[PDB]
């Protein structure tokens, strides 16, 4: 049939659409109770960099 | 569990 | 000139708005429903297998209504999540 | 001496299994033996990554991440299956015990939606930099060091907050 | 803003959600097909 | 920072302060042990280093937040008129603090319609909202009109040292962006400088109904981009 | 001689190292942990209460006994109904039946057998809201 794959893509897409809202709304927990903060000890050094990066160039990175 | 001592 | 701007300032009206912050989350909450709407179906039309110069007409005047809905609740909505524009 | 100090390059418990997948852990093996029975060469690549990750998880809990992809696949090939024999409605008897499995598999689906959203409330939202009860003692004394100190100056301290500092 | 008891209560109905579409799809897909 | 905005009705203020404090140093170093044997003991005496400052807000404010250049800290509270704000380490003599606060007020208590047009607007500002008795060295006063604003007429209740003009783009300006217009102070005391800056200017509801206009084009852009990249074939 | 080529074989060894993984059987080894334990009264423990990183070595053989089970009952709902049908009660002029009866037992066993897992869970960790029991 025809109508059945209509509603299977339509379908598809609400799905895809509650997953990402899913996802987002699981790991927004810690930035909503504290802070939008930086966590354990890696992502600092992974933060420092990226901002070494954002406010020097490419070539000084 | 981080890269951190135990 | 300090003086008479005083005087202007403080023998006006004061700031009415265009439309009360406390209504703008209503309105976002309804023209995403219908900025949704109108582009979901223009993205039918872009499926569908008819000519292609009607094709581009339906296509354009539905982006034409569509863009402006959604303009207009990216503004509310903008203003109702507090980063005011 | 140092990477045996370090707690991300420990052994694994059995809880800590079922803790980070509710009931994905017995549908996995069920869903490699099912994919042994109907061997295609896509499923030999699920069935080494399966045995391997399994390997390699259990010998360092840092791995276990890796091995979160496949299982679900695995996972999702088993549920599969059986939804393809009871939510096929295509007579009493047949209708009622389709419905009793599909209802008891859809149960452990919301069940595992629950277990899923505890878990992360409760033991992965939490940053180390402040400590609820909030304690916040780490971020003053840098905040500190970073105000009444002069700017080119050399702080010893133990490895573990080198980056933070 | 958003409190602790809300965000809890969106992620679990977002959750319950895709769990019941995705089985409606494949009771959908099982079934005529 | 003063942020002015027309579409929400809102006044925002944002201070950064950098404070020091000019009074004796601490032989000996601090000692927590000492100050908190000073705090059991209920010595409420006027001592010389700050432990709490009191931020006089417009009536009126909301929205209120207290955090600095590590984080946002939790020990602040609001009560009528008043901000509370505890740092996050007491700052003896010769200690330094740098943090930021923010608050939010009604725009119709600063801005008012000018009688003979009703896209004449004129602004008055208030120049300090700090703690009592404070003395500033450096101030840099910068209010921020809506886009499509043209500036007309500006004017300081007490001389500055410097004035100037500029633009800035922010969260929605597709187009040139918010109007900044920038006042240098250097010596201010903290209830002696009292005054209003009045700034007059222009905007005509085309500018107003520009914004969503300039979001719209974005999208139909987008648009149109979609359906020609929809309209060809790249078959072999 | 013609049985290192069958799917079976392999499927079961696969299945069985893989169970015996997530059973944790290497944290018995990298740490040399005891058999069992005794407890106050006298019997033996079988389990470590109130510890999550840490357990006996008899731990590991009840969860393969419990995860092979389910795999077993699993196996047997999506490949199994139709040969054990057809080998238990040769009547078959009541075929769907018997398949309804099978699968509703087989569904039934899997419940029970998910219950005693997560018993044998809230066992080592005591604050678990959904014990399923
Ligand atoms: C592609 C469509 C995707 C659909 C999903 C869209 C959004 C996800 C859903 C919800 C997220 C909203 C929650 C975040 C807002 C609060 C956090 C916050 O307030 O943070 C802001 C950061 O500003 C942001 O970036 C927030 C961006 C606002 C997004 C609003 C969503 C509607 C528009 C969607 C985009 C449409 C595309 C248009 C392209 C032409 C703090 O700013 P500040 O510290 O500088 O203070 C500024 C104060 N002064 C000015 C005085 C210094
Ligand atoms: C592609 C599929 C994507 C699926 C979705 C993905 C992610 C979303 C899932 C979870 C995210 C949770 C976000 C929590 C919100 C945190 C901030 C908060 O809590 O805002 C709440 C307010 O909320 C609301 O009233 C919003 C009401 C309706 C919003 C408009 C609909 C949103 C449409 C989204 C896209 C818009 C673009 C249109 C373009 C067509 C707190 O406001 P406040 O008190 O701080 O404001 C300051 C105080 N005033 C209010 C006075 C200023
Ligand atoms: C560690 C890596 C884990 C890998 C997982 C093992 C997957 C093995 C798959 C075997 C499949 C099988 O049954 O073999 C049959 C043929 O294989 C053969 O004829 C002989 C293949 C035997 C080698 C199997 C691989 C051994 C690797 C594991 C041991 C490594 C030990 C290292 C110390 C194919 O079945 P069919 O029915 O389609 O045949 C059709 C004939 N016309
Ligand atoms: C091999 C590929 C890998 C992927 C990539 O391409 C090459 O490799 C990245 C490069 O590194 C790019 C950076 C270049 C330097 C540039 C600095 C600018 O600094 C601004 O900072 C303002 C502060 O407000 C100033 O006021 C402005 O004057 C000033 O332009 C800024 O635009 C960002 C940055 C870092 C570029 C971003 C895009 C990057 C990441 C590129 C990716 C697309
Ligand atoms: C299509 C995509 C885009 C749209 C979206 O994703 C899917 O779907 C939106 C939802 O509608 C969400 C809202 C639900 C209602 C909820 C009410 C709270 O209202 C407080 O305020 C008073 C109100 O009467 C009272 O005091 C109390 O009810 C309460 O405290 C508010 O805090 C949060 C809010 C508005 C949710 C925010 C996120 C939203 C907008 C979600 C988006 C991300
Ligand atoms: C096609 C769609 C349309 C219909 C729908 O989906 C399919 O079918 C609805 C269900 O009825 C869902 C609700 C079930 C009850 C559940 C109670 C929770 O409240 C507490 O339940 C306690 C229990 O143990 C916890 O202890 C607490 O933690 C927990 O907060 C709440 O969070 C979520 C809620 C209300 C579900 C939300 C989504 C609903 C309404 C679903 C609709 C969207
Ligand atoms: C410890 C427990 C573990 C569980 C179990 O007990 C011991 O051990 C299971 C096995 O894995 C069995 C299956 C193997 C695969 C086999 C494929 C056949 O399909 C083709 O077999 C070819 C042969 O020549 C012909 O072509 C035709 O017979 C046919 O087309 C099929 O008939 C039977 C089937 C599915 C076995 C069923 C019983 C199972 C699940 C057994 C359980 C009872
Ligand atoms: C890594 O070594 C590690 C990760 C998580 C946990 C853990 C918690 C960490 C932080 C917490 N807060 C400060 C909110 C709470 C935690 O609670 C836990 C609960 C369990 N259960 C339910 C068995 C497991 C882990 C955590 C730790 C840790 O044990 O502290 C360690
Ligand atoms: C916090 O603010 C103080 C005060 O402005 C800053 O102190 C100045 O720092 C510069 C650069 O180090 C020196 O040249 C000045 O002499 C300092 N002035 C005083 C009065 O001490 C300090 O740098 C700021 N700190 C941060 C992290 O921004
Ligand atoms: C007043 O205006 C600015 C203050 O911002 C200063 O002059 C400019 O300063 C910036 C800062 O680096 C320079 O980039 C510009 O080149 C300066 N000139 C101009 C014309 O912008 C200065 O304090 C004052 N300028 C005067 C009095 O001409």
């Known amino acids: ?61 | 569990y981080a890269n951190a001592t135990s | 000139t300090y003086e008479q701007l005083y005087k202007e300032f403080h023998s006006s009206k004061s700031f009415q708005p265009f439309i009360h912050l406390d209504t703008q989350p209503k309105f976002a909450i309804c023209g995403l429903i219908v900025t949704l709407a109108v582009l979901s179906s223009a993205l039918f039309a872009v499926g569908s297998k008819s000519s292609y110069i009607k094709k581009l007409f339906f296509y354009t005047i539905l982006s034409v209504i569509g863009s402006l809905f959604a303009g207009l609740t990216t503004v509310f909505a903008s203003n109702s999540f507090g980063v005011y524009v | 001496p140092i990477i045996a100090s370090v707690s991300e390059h420990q052994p694994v418990s059995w809880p800590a299994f079922f803790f980070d997948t509710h009931f994905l852990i017995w549908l996995f093996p069920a869903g490699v033996f099912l994919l042994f029975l109907d061997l295609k060469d896509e499923h030999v690549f699920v069935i080494a990554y399966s045995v391997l990750c399994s390997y390699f998880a259990g010998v360092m809990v840092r791995l276990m991440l890796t091995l979160t992809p496949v299982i679900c696949v695995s996972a999702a090939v088993a549920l599969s299956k059986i939804f393809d024999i009871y939510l096929d409605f295509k007579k009493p008897a047949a209708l009622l015990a389709k419905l009793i499995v599909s209802g008891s598999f859809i149960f452990y689906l919301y069940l595992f939606v629950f277990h899923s959203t505890w878990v992360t409330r409760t033991a992965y939202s939490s940053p180390s930099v402040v400590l609820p009860s909030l304690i916040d003692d780490f971020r003053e004394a840098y905040y500190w060091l970073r105000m009444n100190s002069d700017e080119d100056s050399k702080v010893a301290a133990w490895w573990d907050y080198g980056y933070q500092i | 803003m958003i409190s602790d008891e809300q965000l809890n209560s969106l992620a679990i109905t977002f959750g319950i959600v895709m769990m019941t579409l995705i089985v409606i799809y494949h009771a959908v897909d099982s079934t005529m097909s | 920072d003063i942020w002015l905005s027309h579409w929400a009705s809102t006044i925002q203020f944002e201070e950064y302060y950098e404070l020091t404090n000019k009074a004796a140093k601490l032989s000996k170093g601090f000692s927590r042990l000492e100050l908190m044997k000073q705090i059991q003991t209920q010595n409420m005496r006027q001592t010389h280093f700050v432990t709490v400052l009191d931020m006089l807000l417009p009536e009126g404010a909301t929205d209120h937040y207290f955090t600095d250049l590590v984080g946002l800290v939790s020990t602040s509270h609001a009560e009528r008129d008043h901000f509370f704000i505890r740092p996050r380490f007491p700052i003896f003599g010769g200690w330094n603090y740098n943090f930021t606060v923010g608050w939010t007020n009604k725009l119709s208590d600063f801005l008012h319609v000018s009688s003979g047009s009703d896209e004449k607007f004129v602004a008055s500002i208030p120049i300090l909202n700090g703690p009592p008795d404070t003395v500033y060295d450096n101030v840099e006063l910068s209010v921020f009109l809506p886009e499509g604003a043209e500036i007309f007429d500006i004017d300081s209740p007490v001389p500055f040292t410097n004035v100037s003009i500029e633009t800035q783009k922010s969260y929605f300006d597709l187009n040139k962006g918010h109007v900044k217009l920038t006042f240098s102070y250097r010596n201010l005391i903290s209830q002696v400088a009292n005054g209003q800056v009045l700034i007059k200017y222009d905007y005509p509801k085309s500018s107003f109904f520009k914004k969503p206009l300039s979001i719209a084009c974005y999208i139909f852009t987008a648009l149109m981009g979609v359906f020609v990249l929809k309209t060809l074939n790249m078959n072999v | 001689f013609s049985i290192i080529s069958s799917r079976i074989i392999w499927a079961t060894l696969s299945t069985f190292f893989i169970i015996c993984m997530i059973s944790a059987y290497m944290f018995n080894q990298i740490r040399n942990t005891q058999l069992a334990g005794v407890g106050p009264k006298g019997e033996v423990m079988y389990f470590l209460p109130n510890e999550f990183q840490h357990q006996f070595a008899i731990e590991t053989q009840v969860m393969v006994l419990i995860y092979g089970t389910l795999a077993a009952l699993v196996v047997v709902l999506v490949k199994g109904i139709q040969f054990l049908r057809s080998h238990l009660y040769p009547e078959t002029k009541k075929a769907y039946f018997i398949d309804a009866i099978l699968a509703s037992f087989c569904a039934l066993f899997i419940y029970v057998f998910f219950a005693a897992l997560t018993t044998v869970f809230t066992i080592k960790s005591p604050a678990y809201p959904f014990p399923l029991l």
Not at chain 1, 4 to 20: D, G
């Open chain 1, 1 to 61: 049939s025809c109508v059945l794959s209509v509603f299977q893509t339509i379908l598809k897409l609400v799905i895809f659409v509650a997953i990402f809202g899913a996802a987002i709304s699981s790991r927004l927990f810690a930035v909503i109770k504290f802070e939008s903060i930086i966590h354990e000890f890696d992502p600092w050094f992974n933060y420092r960099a990226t901002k070494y990066l954002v406010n020097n160039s490419f070539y000084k990175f």
